Amino acid sequence: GFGNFGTS
Amino acid sequence: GFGNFGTS
Amino acid sequence: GFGNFGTS
Amino acid sequence: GFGNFGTS
Amino acid sequence: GFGNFGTS
Amino acid sequence: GFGNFGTS
Amino acid sequence: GFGNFGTS
Amino acid sequence: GFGNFGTS
Amino acid sequence: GFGNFGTS
Amino acid sequence: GFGNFGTS
């Protein structure tokens, strides 16, 4: 993944 | 995934 | 992954 | 991975 | 800002 | 801003 | 702003 | 800023 | 800033 | 990996 903020 | 904010 | 901030 | 900040 | 992905 | 994906 | 995806 | 990926 | 990846 | 800050 890329450019993700705070994901689970 | 990409460009996701706070997803579960 | 790349450019991810605080992901789990 | 690269350019990741605080990921687990 | 913080946690931004891209150009500014 | 924070957690933005793209251009600004 | 935060959590925006795209251009601004 | 901190935790930014890209150009500024 | 800190923890930045790219050009400024 | 490269250019990573505080990752686990």
Contact H5, E2 (CB under 8 A): no
Nearest CA in chain H to D7: H3
Report resolution in angstroms. 0.9
Beta carbons within 10 angstroms of residue H1's beta carbon:
16
Experimental approach taken:
electron diffraction
- Give ∠ CA D5-E3-E8 in degrees, rounded to 5: 125
**Closest approach of D1 to chain J, Cα-based (Å):** 5
CB contacts of A2 in chain E (<8 Å) are 5
Contact F5, A7 (CB under 8 A): no
* CA-to-CA dists, residue B5 to C7, E7, G3, angstroms: 10, 18, 6
CB contacts of F3 in chain A (<8 Å) are 5-6
* Yes or no, beta carbons of C5 and A2 under 8 Å apart: no
Smallest CA-to-CA distance from J6 within F2, E8, H3 is with H3
